Amino acid sequence: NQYDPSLLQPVPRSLNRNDLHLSATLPFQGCDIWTLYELSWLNQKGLPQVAIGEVSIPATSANLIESKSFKLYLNSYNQTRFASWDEVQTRLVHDLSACAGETVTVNVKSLNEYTAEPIVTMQGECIDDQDIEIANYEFDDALLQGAAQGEEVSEVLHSHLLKSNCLITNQPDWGSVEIAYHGAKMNREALLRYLVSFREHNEFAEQCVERIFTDIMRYCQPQSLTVYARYTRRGGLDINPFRSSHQSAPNHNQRMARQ
Amino acid sequence: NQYDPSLLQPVPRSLNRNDLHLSATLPFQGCDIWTLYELSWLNQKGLPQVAIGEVSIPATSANLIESKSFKLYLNSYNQTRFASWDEVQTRLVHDLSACAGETVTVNVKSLNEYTAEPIVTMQGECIDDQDIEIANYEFDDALLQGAAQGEEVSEVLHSHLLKSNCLITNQPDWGSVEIAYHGAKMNREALLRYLVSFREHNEFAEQCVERIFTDIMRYCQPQSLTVYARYTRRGGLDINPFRSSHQSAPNHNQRMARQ
Ligand SMILES: NCc1c[nH]c2nc(N)[nH]c(=O)c12
Ligand SMILES: NCc1c[nH]c2nc(N)[nH]c(=O)c12
Ligand SMILES: [Mg+2]
């Protein structure tokens, strides 16, 4: 099958935001950063081209794009001849923006642009090295009750232990998550227990990040908050949702060890 | 949801090797290097652990391991408590060795072992920048007929345009491939056309590398030859087959841009 934009499947963001009981105006801003590791098409003479794509979809877009549909759409490029890389980038912007309902940004980069680029970790302190027992992996937002009793602080925490189950497919999704806030100091055991409680929970990556943001806001009430997760790819695409009370986007899209 | 070695499914190497008209005495040595990006289990107190696994399966093993079955086997670790990282490595060596039919090597690495490690490209000259026209996409080993008529050389060539199809999932596989040899200098156009002709060919990653090796050996007759391909992951697992006249293992196992 060749180029087929009808393969793209929008999902309205409002569907799941409903269960978060979000007020008239969003309590966050941000974007979903996608990495497209398997971009490939043919040039006009039929010779294959390969590239990596970077896409930023605004959190305010009416729709997110369902990932399997995004994969199938990209595969439709594989046997299609295009006269230039410019055309490919242009079509991606057009088709993904039409699906999402808002202008998305797309970078199409040749593979040489990645030579010597680093694997990165996240900022601040890892909270994973704790001596606690966990036996109940059922989702429980109430694990955050009274979690922020401490002195007013600014800190950045991260964990590599985020896992949830894919809403449509049950297959596990693996991620790291970075939480930066200014407010009463958060209890790290409670936070890790809460994050681990996603382990047998069904939702999309974007929706998990919004749930973490909204739960921390309601239970811990920081003055400012950013939640950023980076998930490992499925079908050649990864999703990196960023949500913040005050920030727009992360500084870069550098990959982590499992990505 | 517990640890289950019965999920592993072997596939005999003999199926495709018989199709290549090879004897039990191989014309190559080497190994299949796998990267397990999503290795995760529970510690003795039920707290999730995450790691990256690096596995080497000897090319002399009776069997390769089917990738989906390998993924499902690894998933069975996700909700299983293990006493230590050493127990995990031991179980992996035991089960994977049993399935392959020969001792496999396993390294279980913490994610911090990858921090600030650079993405690499392949060695030598990239052959992809050619202004040629491709008229069909049918596999054709005869594209190598008379491809080695240059002076005696030792050189390393590579391409990022290797693609084949995975029949059992109906999904493309994407690879880069590095070819190092001592023999009559190879025609770059013939080599590139040959590799491009895999684009709609069904075979496993390991099998494609053996086909490339044996085709180059019979059509180009180098005195010595090494073929190393690095494929993008599927299901959290990537395969990197290495086959060589004289070398037992590749010089590195570092990830490339699309991996
Ligand atoms: N997690 C499973 C999943 C399936 N399709 C998806 N599409 C998007 N955008 N995000 C997701 O997390 C998923
Ligand atoms: N390429 C498709 C595929 C499916 N399962 C596989 N298992 C192995 N070991 N190699 C492969 O290439 C595949
Ligand atoms: Mg290293």
From Swiss-Prot, chains A, B:
A single MF term (Gene Ontology): preQ1 synthase activity
Recorded catalytic activity of this chain's protein: 7-aminomethyl-7-carbaguanine + 2 NADP(+) = 7-cyano-7-deazaguanine + 2 NADPH + 3 H(+)
Superkingdom in the source lineage: Bacteria
Active site as annotated: 166, 173
Location in the cell: Cytoplasm
Sequence segments annotated as region (Disordered): 240-259
Binding residue positions for substrate: 65-67, 205-206
Any one Pfam family match given in the protein's UniProt record, by short name: QueF
Binding site for NADPH: 67-68, 234-235
GO annotation, cellular component aspect: cytosol
Polar residues compositional bias, start-end: 242-259
Keyword NADP attributed: yes
Enzyme Commission (EC) number: 1.7.1.13
Keyword NADP: yes
Pathway listed: tRNA modification; tRNA-queuosine biosynthesis
Protein function: Catalyzes the NADPH-dependent reduction of 7-cyano-7-deazaguanine (preQ0) to 7-aminomethyl-7-deazaguanine (preQ1).
Family, per entry: Belongs to the GTP cyclohydrolase I family. QueF type 2 subfamily.
Entry protein name: NADPH-dependent 7-cyano-7-deazaguanine reductase
Protein encoded by which gene: queF
